[PDB]
């Protein structure tokens, strides 16, 4: 129902964390508890992150009102000759915040949230990766919003400087006027301000790139683990392998990368106008663009996976098995739910791209269509879903080597096109039903202890007789 | 040479391998705390840059021993100068730097001995005349992959530095590329002439091959260079040793005295005041030995609590309307100044602590004669008299233009509260009885500092203000003594033919037009840098001569006020110290400190006298100022009688601002007498002739330029004008009497009508004045001191509609307007052209309008509702 006193009674280790935060924090500790009821009653979240430089001002004025009044009532009682001064001491440090009210709301709102982390952590101990991912993406969105605001402000300041320089140029006044000295001095000041804004924007962009690379390198092992779990679950074992969290994460990452690249394009286009000497932007823009492109390519290269391997529809008991002259069902998904709204996306298929060097293997040709087209609205309605439920294979000891089916896609978005390839789990082709009785055991021989998935060359009781 | 091979090897490398080579045995300093210490605003116990440890390593090992006066070339942020300031034998540190984009600028700090260090920015060393010095430091130089350009830069640096050294000067100069022959041969002769050698600083990074040239050492160049090159090429063979972190130095805090004093006090006058002040705070009375005062006497100090901050209230209501003005740097950089004890000390050191020189005999005689004649001339129709208590009560009751005073917050809380009590009058009577016997006991001043921005000093029409507060009783006593000067309008244009006191702002343009109708040369409008601190004792003695027209108790009181207070002053000022905050008490004889109105009158008188003397000199009446002889004294007196009155009608002096139209252009070349009295001009060479104007619409006066306007029917008006940025930026500042919505709303509405009355003729200010008056809920009296304190009009504070006031001011009460046909709408009033508006600072005409035009219609009609639950009423 409240805070402060709850933290005090809890225990020392959380008090030390409380001690550190509130100490260096400008807001004095004493003022926190006297005004505790009022502070927690205010909607600081709306003031810090919203559109209306009026609510922040209102909260500013009310804060001053409360600070002034409470001092007077306590000043009437003597022997409180230390808190009264502290009330006036805080009244001086609030004064610089009058320039920008929103600085108050952000500082208070952040302070309220942090002690909530301590409280929940303390009770949980007394009585992970996904939450870290969500926190990371939330911070990313917030600081990207901050970067957007900074870019807009820089654009406006550069525009007004260009207008002032233009009106000075059309003036054509070569005089020894002290007004001219004043205006040249203020021109130098404007140039210094512009340089400072540019360097700050560059630093923020670099921080964003670092954080986003960290998120991607944390994300990829989850995809690898899901692939391993899918391999272990396709072998007649019930284990869920849902893709919703991974697809959402991939979509968020793709959106963030595209937004970052698009902003840098506009930044360079703006900088072109009044580009001049000692401009780090001329190199920073291209280096950041190259890094962003590299990260996008790296993410998209592993972003292609196959949800469902080619399976027998009539007999689902045996997966990863092929028979001549029959239809097969395959499902491939893109973890990134992004696509241009005017261009359909095209996916091709192939079988046995790389043949072995041994005696001529049983190469097979896809009689049916190897190409499928997805309508753009399908990505919105259900996602990037590819289904081939009628694929067939024909033939141009039986289980000594396996065959690999490959998927190839050209992904295009915002003018960037990348070639993408992926492979499915190795499979064996049988020309008759009877040989499957030993083909199952031979497939197990490959599956149980294969460290390389692309190598075409007691405990079992959970599989042999689990059915 | 081996250095070339080392450089080629380093150049042939990759970035990843490069980034690891840097730290392989160097010594680092742990700056993990200094960065965030400086970021939050701390100004002590910290090192600004990394060079402090670099120079410390040399000093502790007594390679170079600074002493006397130290000159730093290219100080950058200023680590070396700040470190040197805290040493023992150092007496003064001077630093020059070349600021601007891509370059470091100095920053202010308050470490030990911070008052002995002075730094400058935007000065190029390569074309600076040499000056006397005892120690020389140079740390300039930039690296480049090409060795030839590095050699050229090193040669240029050496040639620049060579001119400064003498036989007995300590030096420490950085040399960048010493391993190739064309620098070696040059350094041979230098080492032969001046001695010293080269040594390497261990703390330097491994990427560079720089060295340093020191004063107290010996050896051979080539052997040392070869040894260093061999070590460099052998270094990249072992493992990666973790750099040995070293703790950053701390500099403490406080001030440091130099040991010279040049002022002697008069104890028989101020002994009682000093004794009383000491007895009041006897508990913590102590003598400090580190007072930084040179030209002021020092007596003692005690303890107090710090008052002040950085930046003030910004008017909330005024904002949210001038949204497009946030990007403009002039508006924001001028917002508010610093009044903390550190800023007060900085201002006091910069401006108040100065010294002036006495004039010669001829100047003294001329000033005496002119002052006598002028005093006899002004009092031809008037007669001095004493003021009463009832007038003072009436003035204080109606919130008149009282001086800057403190109301003795202990016993009472406000002036109006304190007037009605009888004990206040008992204290006043006691002080009056003491004064009547030529003694004073409770007449001390309080100082407060202001004026401290970068771009704010160029647009606040002031800077270095340093205003003086006074007790209420002393203010009443001074009023009783010398209120007749202002209550009788002694300096009006009717009585004295030069003053403009009592004229509103909207009427000075006509006066300037009338001055231009005479025959002569051009108009000259020079100004003085820091007029208030250039007043000598002679000016005070000359102004004291008004008592010759008084008699009796009035004469005795006036003489006592002039003698015991105006030229024997005691002042309290704050000072930061390691133990907290202390208050010092100091004394001084000359310089001007008094009430505002008395100061205005006396400044006007002195300015008139000085201008008359300069006009005398230009005409060639007298020749030599060293000594004045007979047949010139009579000539001077005859000139004053014959044409004295008509010469005073060629000028217009408000305060310390003057505009003069002489008889001939010889006026611009006569600068001996003006420089002799100490009235040095501002931003000009000492003997450079002045500059005139051939048009009356360009001459500045009271920080204004006066355009002229033509109505639709044909009548012509003259209107004031300024730079719009200054007006908008000042309109955002609240004086600090708020802590409420009603106060700030009333203030905004109060000086949102100045714009509708005076500055109505420009597009961008007449639209922003209707919105603000449509946003406040009306029905509230707009009572608050706005601006232009000296202009005694304050007439836009009425309640009725502005059209009637405009008709009453600009038509019927305008002597220079012939026909009196009135107007009946706000559309007949014209605008300030189209391009002249952009010239003076508007935001219309091109893409800036593409940004602003969001303000109009789209934003105004929605922000007025954004005001919130606070009601209003439409006006547009
Ligand atoms: Zn007195
Ligand atoms: Zn103008």
Numbering used by the authors:
A (entry chain A): 1 to 127, 140 to 408, 423 to 483, 497 to 506
B (entry chain B): 8 to 883
The authors write:
Flaviviruses, including Zika virus (ZIKV) and Dengue virus (DENV), rely on their non-structural protein 5 (NS5) for both replication of viral genome and suppression of host IFN signaling. NS5 protein is comprised of two domains: an N-terminal methyltransferase (MTase) domain responsible for RNA capping to protect the viral genome and a C-terminal RNA-dependent RNA polymerase (RdRP) domain for replicating the viral genome. For instance, DENV NS5 interacts with human STAT2 (hSTAT2) to promote protein degradation of hSTAT2 mediated by ubiquitin ligase UBR4. The MTase and RdRP domains of DENV2 NS5 form an extended conformation to interact with the coiled-coil and N-terminal domains of hSTAT2, thereby promoting hSTAT2 degradation in cells.
To provide the molecular basis for the DENV2 NS5−hSTAT2 interaction, we performed single particle cryo-EM analysis for full-length DENV2 NS5 in complex with full-length hSTAT2. Atomic models were built for both types, revealing nearly identical structures for the regions beyond the hSTAT2 ND, except for a slight tilt of the hSTAT2 CCD and DBD. The complex of DENV2 NS5−hSTAT2 is assembled into a mushroom shape, with the roof formed by the NS5 MTase and RdRP and the hSTAT2 ND, and the stem formed by hSTAT2 CCD and DBD. Detailed inspection of the interaction between DENV2 NS5 and hSTAT2 reveals three discrete binding interfaces: NS5 RdRP−hSTAT2 CCD, NS5 MTase−hSTAT2 CCD, and NS5 RdRP−hSTAT2 ND. At the NS5 RdRP−hSTAT2 ND interface, the α5- and α6-helices of the ND interact with the Fingers of the RdRP via van der Waals contacts and/or hydrogen-bonding interactions, involving residues D53, R92, Q95, P96, S98, Q99 and D100 of the ND and residues Q313, S316, S318, M320, V321, R326, L327 of the Fingers. Furthermore, residues D52, S54, T57, F60, F61, L64 and N68 of the ND interact with residues W746, L748 and L873 of the Thumb via van der Waals contacts.
